[PDB]
Design a protein around this ligand. Structure first.
Ligand SMILES: *C(=O)[C@@H](NC(=O)/C(=N\OC)c1csc(N)n1)[C@@H]1N=C(C(=O)O)C(=C)CS1
Ligand SMILES: [Cl-]
Ligand SMILES: [Cl-]
Ligand SMILES: [Zn+2]
Ligand SMILES: [Zn+2]
Ligand SMILES: [Zn+2]
Ligand SMILES: [Zn+2]
Ligand SMILES: [Zn+2]
Lengths: 16, 385
């Protein structure tokens, strides 16, 4: 299981 | 590597908000999540917290927790619940959202004064209140001011400015407990049962994330003043994409919690808190903003058996201010309430606010609030038409 997370500028900041 | 340290707290709430909303735990379920966090703002806040480049701390154990909100949509753009705390375990307790600590006087604007002007108990910021010996309604227990003294007949704006307790409790009596409690609901804040003590304390009997106050809730609440009386539920996420292709958009629906006139009046009075009041350490001559300070206290048992200094002390120091674009609530103190905030440590909350707000506004050309229709100036105060 992998979930990518982006900021308000829609740029990746995390993967879990 | 997995995720930067400075996003631990933020990411913790994202996981939770997605959970509450969709019902899925993104740690065991694949999803793409687009959040509201302003990465650059986060980084800067982290440095204010963990470096000596912006604020002089008395030590490394003193704590801080704050939340910054976009007053136009309730989006949480930055959040951090602790400093110099590197006990790496992911998504531990985020103090920015915990309501276990007292927010003191920051409760006065939203629990006593906003409701008062809103419901017609006072018609202007010049209204004369009473800072005289006064006991909590229905009891012989006296309401004390920090200096155990009384200023007597002073104006509403001045009572707020100096944060006099008597006028605040008295005001809460005139507003009425039930509708004071209903007014807080309009701002996301609630108590199991509200009591007069809550006129100057967020201390509540039941301990939930919902009862009481936290940096998260205080920021959303004060955001309502800044935008003209509209409350937006705090948001960490605005969109998620499931591994299948269908997406979910989260709406920033706002509910009016107070009149446009009430907001301007509260705001008008709160900027004098930064200019000639308790919140002078967060003042910026070039920035149109308003805020309120707060200081909790120690019980008698604590003062006698645990406090080893004659210096003015407190377990909590708070500040909650806002500009026309951002609202920010700050909390300071030690994990162990028994370790007091002393002298230099007490100015920490205000200065942390000033540093962040400088970062967020110095670049733009900040605008002031405009006296709405239904009110008029008269020297230093504002009255209702
Ligand atoms: C509001 O914050 C008010 N605080 C108090 O009366 C309390 N303690 O004073 C020592 C208090 C509130 S809740 C609790 N457990 N104790 C006034 N606020 C300020 C301020 O800094 O804003 C004051 C300087 C005077 S006391
Ligand atoms: Cl008089
Ligand atoms: Cl994907
Ligand atoms: Zn920076
Ligand atoms: Zn450190
Ligand atoms: Zn009176
Ligand atoms: Zn009661
Ligand atoms: Zn988007």
């Amino acid at each position: 299981t992998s979930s990518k997370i982006y900021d308000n500028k829609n740029q990746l900041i995390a993967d879990l | 590597s997995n995720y930067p340290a400075y996003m631990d707290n933020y990411l913790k709430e994202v996981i939770n908000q997605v959970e509450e909303e969709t019902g899925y735990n993104l740690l065991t379920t694949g999803m793409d999540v687009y959040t509201n966090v302003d990465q650059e703002a986060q980084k800067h806040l982290w440095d204010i917290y963990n470096t000596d480049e912006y604020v002089a701390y008395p030590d490394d154990e003193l704590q801080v927790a704050s939340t910054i909100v976009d007053v136009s949509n309730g989006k949480v753009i930055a959040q951090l619940g602790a400093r110099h705390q590197s006990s790496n375990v992911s998504f531990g307790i985020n103090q920015a959202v915990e309501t276990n600590r007292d927010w003191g006087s920051t409760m006065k604007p939203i629990t006593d004064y906003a409701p008062a002007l809103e419901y017609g108990v006072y018609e202007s910021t010049a209204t004369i209140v009473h800072d005289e010996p006064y006991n909590y309604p229905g009891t012989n227990t006296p309401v004390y001011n920090w200096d155990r003294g009384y200023f007597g007949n002073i104006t509403l704006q001045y009572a707020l400015q100096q944060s006099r307790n008597v006028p605040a409790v008295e005001t809460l009596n005139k507003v009425g407990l039930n509708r004071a409690k209903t007014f807080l609901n309009g701002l996301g804040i609630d108590y199991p049962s509200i009591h007069y003590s809550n006129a100057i304390s967020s201390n509540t009997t039941e301990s939930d994330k919902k009862y009481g106050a936290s940096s998260e809730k205080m920021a959303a609440a004060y955001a309502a003043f800044a935008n003209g009386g509209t409350y937006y539920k705090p948001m960490y996420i605005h969109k998620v994409v499931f591994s299948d292709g269908s997406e979910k958009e989260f709406s920033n629906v706002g509910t009016r919690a107070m009149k446009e006139t009430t907001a301007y009046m509260m705001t008008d009075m709160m900027k004098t808190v930064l200019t000639y009041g308790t919140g002078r350490n967060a003042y910026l001559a070039w920035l149109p903003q308003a805020g309120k300070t707060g200081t909790s206290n120690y019980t008698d048992e604590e003062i006698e058996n645990h406090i080893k200094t004659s210096q003015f002390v407190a377990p909590d120091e708070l500040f909650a201010g806002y500009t026309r674009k951002y609202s920010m609530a700050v909390w300071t103190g030690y994990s162990n309430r028994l370790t007091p905030l002393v002298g230099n440590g007490l100015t920490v909350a205000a200065k942390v606010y000033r540093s962040m707000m400088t970062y967020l506004s110095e670049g733009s050309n900040p605008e002031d609030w405009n006296i709405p229709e239904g009110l008029y100036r008269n020297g230093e105060f504002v009255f209702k038409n």
